[PDB]
């Protein structure tokens, strides 16, 4: 154990899992575009092997490159942002049925989003275009690399 | 050192770099769709840390899940395939200018492709749609997770 899972740096590789994922038609944290979410998601650091449940993380103490995460408040819900260098790659668990994000034809890099109630309940959101993997519940697995902080 | 970089298994995470990459309008190994290629690419196993220059691998000796890779011959050129669970995520090196693959609106998962001449020269190809990052030369970095063998 060298760097905590809470401490993030540019170039980190993250392996997320969203069991029993549901489909949200519009997500405010990404500017009103569809997303997949699970309330029992888990974040894996592939290189170091550390892991943590998303609902078990106090997200106001999470830092990226030495600084606190970028957070946005939408209709009384707090959303924390974990930017990535590139797009978030996700697929249905156990199958080769892959998904795609809202900016499938765009240079913009994707970013993980977390809702947290201040206690022990938290969601994890990933950008999607439609129900390409179904309406839910469905197990999905995501892979991405952590990128620099938003400007 | 437990498993060689030549040995691959489902769930492995690969960090590829395609320095001074060029743009190919049509790639046969992917059914005549554009690709990016570099002749000095490097394959990095993120979890185990092992790395190898793509030109330094005898690709006929590479195995995935205990079996040899799927290879195709197009106009006398041999292409080796490394399937991935999901799409290949790549971006320009040092920037947030991300790219997208040819099947951006498709469930189909992506797969890395390598050309090898039987000696010490080899290329690495990634699926793309257009010159979203330029015509080349340009440094790009790709991230993906190794998937099951083709059926």
């Amino acid at each position, epitope marked *: 154990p060298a760097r905590p899972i809470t401490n993030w740096r540019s170039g980190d590789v993250v392996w997320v899992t969203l069991p029993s994922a549901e489909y949200a038609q519009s997500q405010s944290a990404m500017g009103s575009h569809p997303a997949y979410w699970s309330e029992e998601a888990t974040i894996i650091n592939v290189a170091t092997g550390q892991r943590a449940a998303v609902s078990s993380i106090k997200w106001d103490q999470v*830092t990226l490159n030495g600084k606190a995460l970028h957070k946005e408040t939408h209709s009384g819900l707090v959303y924390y942002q974990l930017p990535l260098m590139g797009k978030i790659n996700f697929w249905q668990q156990g199958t080769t049925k892959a998904g795609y994000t809202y900016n499938y034809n765009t240079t913009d890099s994707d970013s993980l989003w977390v809702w947290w109630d201040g206690g022990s309940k938290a969601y994890l959101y990933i950008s999607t275009y439609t129900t390409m993997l179904g309406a839910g519940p469905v197990n999905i697995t995501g892979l991405g690399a952590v990128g620099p902080n938003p400007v | 050192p437990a498993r060689p970089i030549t040995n691959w298994r489902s769930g492995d995470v690969v960090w590829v770099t395609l320095p001074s990459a060029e743009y190919a309008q049509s790639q046969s190994a992917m059914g005549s769709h554009p690709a990016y290629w570099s002749e000095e690419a490097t394959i990095i196993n993120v979890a185990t840390g092992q790395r190898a220059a793509v030109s330094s691998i005898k690709w006929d000796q590479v195995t995935l899940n205990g079996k040899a890779l799927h290879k195709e011959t197009h106009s006398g050129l041999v292409y080796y395939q490394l399937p991935l669970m999901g799409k290949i995520n790549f971006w320009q090196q040092g920037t947030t200018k991300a790219g997208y693959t040819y099947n951006y609106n498709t469930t189909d998962s992506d797969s890395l492709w390598v050309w090898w001449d039987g000696g010490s020269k080899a290329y690495l190809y990634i699926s793309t749609y257009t010159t979203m990052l330029g015509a080349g030369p340009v440094n790009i970095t790709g991230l993906g997770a190794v998937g099951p063998n083709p059926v």
Partner: antibody, heavy 128, light 103 residues
């Protein structure tokens, strides 16, 4: 358990090569960068250079430009330091410290390598 | 990275503030370490303010960008040492200069 152990203290004459090793155990040797820091008995800490234990790249200091070479051994998880001219002012405790944050697989995308010094070595004293 | 206080002596139980100044913007890529006469320097906080696990809660960091500071709420006798601020922003790692604290 993460720990770095260094070789024993040495005494050298003016003009000689001193090779100091720093064994690594408890983690992935090739994943983390390593540094070398000198400590004169009265003065403060002087950073000397950095090493990539996966490819062997080095980045030395201007003062220690023509006199310092750093090497690694993946098989035994050890990093080496050598000082060549070795004048009397090179009497210091030499430290190996594991660097964190950027972990040698990003490459140049995270090589302003940012991370505090996870375990320092025990130290090795060299007297000229 | 000059350390403005070079040597400060304060009564047991007082508050100690030690400041570091950088030549350029660093962000939170600075750490505070404590060194006893014969030992390797021990790590107090990861970044500008991030306490190491196992270090008493007396030690607390602050500052960002260029001006950094180290605070100690109580001055128990175990505090007789030297403290250093070192940046890990740019390729040449540099250290502070040290403060000798007495009781």
């Amino acid at each position: 358990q993460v720990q770095l152990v260094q070789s024993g203290a040495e005494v050298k004459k003016p003009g000689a090569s001193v090779k100091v090793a720093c064994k690594a155990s408890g983690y992935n040797f090739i994943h983390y960068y390593l540094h070398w820091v000198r400590q004169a008995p009265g003065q403060g800490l002087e950073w000397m250079g950095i090493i990539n234990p996966s490819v062997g790249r080095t980045t030395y200091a201007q003062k220690f430009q023509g006199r310092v070479t750093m090497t690694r051994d993946t098989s035994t998880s050890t990093v080496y330091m050598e000082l060549s001219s070795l004048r009397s002012e090179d009497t210091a405790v030499y430290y190996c410290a594991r660097d964190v944050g950027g972990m040698t697989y990003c490459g140049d995308e995270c090589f302003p390598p940012r991370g505090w010094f996870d375990p320092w070595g025990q130290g090795t004293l060299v007297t000229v | 990275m000059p350390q403005v206080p070079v040597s400060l002596s304060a009564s047991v139980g007082d508050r100690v503030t030690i400041t570091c100044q950088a030549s350029q913007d660093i962000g939170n890529y600075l750490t505070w370490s404590q060194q006893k006469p014969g030992k390797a320097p021990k790590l107090l906080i990861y970044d500008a303010s991030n306490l190491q696990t196992g270090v008493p809660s007396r030690f607390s960091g602050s500052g960002s960008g260029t001006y950094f500071t180290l605070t100690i709420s109580s001055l128990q006798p175990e505090d007789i040492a030297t403290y250093y601020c070192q940046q890990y922003d740019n390729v040449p790692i540099t250290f502070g200069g040290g403060t000798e604290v007495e009781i």
